[model samples]
Target: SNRLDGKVAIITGGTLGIGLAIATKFVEEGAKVMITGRHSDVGEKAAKSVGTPDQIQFFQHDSSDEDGWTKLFDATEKAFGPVSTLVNNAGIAVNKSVEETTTAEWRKLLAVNLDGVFFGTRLGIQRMKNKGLGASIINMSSIEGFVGDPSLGAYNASKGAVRIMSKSAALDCALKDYDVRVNTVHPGYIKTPSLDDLPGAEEAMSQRTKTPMGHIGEPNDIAYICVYLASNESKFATGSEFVVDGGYTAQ
Candidate 1:
């Protein structure tokens, strides 16, 4: 049976990797999803991979744009009714250490990874509160959000901000009785293309052997956790950090 039957969702960065995997899973669970990405061609292809235009739609969105959130929401409302789920999964990573990172690089990464989540959270709250639905917001953080790496200073800062911001927003909605739940999902080394270009990535990837699970996780690993959060099964859970890291942080 479909856990997310009749749910409407908006997934940012759904054109590829984890986000795309989430969209596909949601569609399979009988949810209507609108996926956004910077590239319309790729977004359209990803949307098609899930279902037709009636089941899934693709929109071109720049996550960092504050005003653009309302526009995206409006388009989604017109297509799929009021959204019940929002996934702030759009992020960019830079492989430079603090000493090697340029100011421009840091700013760009923060714009996409931090600012984008803020915009999504704000607008998602507004929409869900208005409708009084038990809506869910899932922010995509990383194990880096809690643990820092010497070469991932900017990435760590941005994700860490997302981790706490999600808690604050979740508490606000819960206290106000808005029926909204906000949580952060921290993924370790999921097999995504984004990690492909990192220098010495193979060497770093080898560290997955140290995980208690003893292997890398797939996109579906995090995607299924998202499904649980998006469904009524997690109604009592909010302002929480769901670590889908295969026990990397358990040690």
Candidate 2:
């Protein structure tokens, strides 16, 4: 009941999807959780599902804005205490080929998917370093990072960038002064709103044939790993890149 009881965490893109799942799990494990999202309705609903209003707070944050990142950490500290856990799980899937994709789409994808993770991790390290409380920064990547998805050019590029960014920052932090941990987790097709919007949503089961598990993952699939990484149990692990894709990339 007391895994993360005293800890405080901020989950980017926490209004819905994987971020919300992680936030809910954190609260269930006893942490005070704050979720950031542009959609107030979804944020409020998600917060209520996790715990009481006192235990969960939701704020409007556009992660691509560095100024917003600073405000996020500041407000979280003022309300919940120093952030010990951060999940950079907010992202969008842009499906288009290189030529088919627009310049604006490419830039926007990078801003939200890659830059957001960078800003969150950067701010989190500075805020948690002096507290000596230990910290975990979890970045969301995808199988597209390791493999090619020609249809998702922008998304692939963004996630691929995040994967390397997570590793490089993790190593840099470890070598520098802070004891903070940064890692990336790649989740395959999960039955979320994101996947639900896929072209053949009803027939998406075929997407799992490539996976050894013969199925896609659930939101809880990634949330469970987030729990382990956020907890003291994974103290020895830093810059660890986890694959929670039900063996999708095993081939």
Candidate 3:
């Protein structure tokens, strides 16, 4: 129950889907949770719904902005304390083939998906490198990061970058003698509030059949791993990819 006791965490895009699920679990496990979103109203609402008034706080943050990273971490420190866990969970996707993808679409995806992770990890290391408690950074990648989807060229590229970037960061932190750990979580076909809106029902039907387990994942499916990583329980689990995709990648 108290796996994350004394931990402080920040989960981006925390008003929805896997982000919200992770936030909920972190609170359940006794962490001080700060959930951020782009919208003020939604963030406040999520803060109230996810945990007790004192247990969680909501900070409106733009994951794509570098300056926002500074503000977000500062706010996290003021609200709770130094961050023990940071889930770079904010991301965007574009469903177009390489030939069909527009430059703007590609740039936007990378801006939020790739650039956001970089900004968070960079500052996370700097702030946490000296902390006695250490820290864990969980980058949310996807199954598409490992495999290709014809209609997800930009999405695939961005997530693929995240998968490898996490490993590099982890190794660098280790070499520098920092206790911070970096890892990536790759989820496949997890049905959340936004999934149907993004890819539609037809694709949802196809995904169910495509997944080797013959079923889609719930948001907690990913949140569970996030909990383990956020806790001292995963002290040895850095620079790795934790996949929770119902065996979708096995084949």
RMSD of each: 1.4, 1.5, 1.4
lDDT of each: 0.89, 0.84, 0.88
lDDT of 2 at 42: 80
* Model 1, residue 111: C-alpha shift (Å): 0.4
The alpha-carbon deviation from the true structure for residue 134 of candidate 3, after best TM-score superposition, in angstroms, is: 2.9
- The alpha-carbon lDDT assigned to residue 214 of candidate 2 equals 66
For candidate 1, report its TM-score. 0.96
Candidate order by lDDT, highest to lowest? 1, 3, 2
TM-score of the candidate numbered 2? Answer: 0.95
Q: Model 1, 1-251: lDDT tens per residue?
A: 59998899999999898998999899999899999998888778788878999999998999998888999999998998988999999999988898999999999999999999998999889888847567999999999998888989899999999999999999999898898999999998887878776756745554745466667788889899999999989999999998878787877
lDDT, residue 196, model 3:
73
Model 1, residue 97: C-alpha shift (Å): 1.6
Better of 2 and 3 by lDDT: 3
Ten contiguous residues minimizing lDDT sum, candidate 2: 201-210
Misplaced by over 4 Å in model 1 are 199-203, 208-210
Q: How does each model score on TM-score?
A: 0.96, 0.95, 0.96
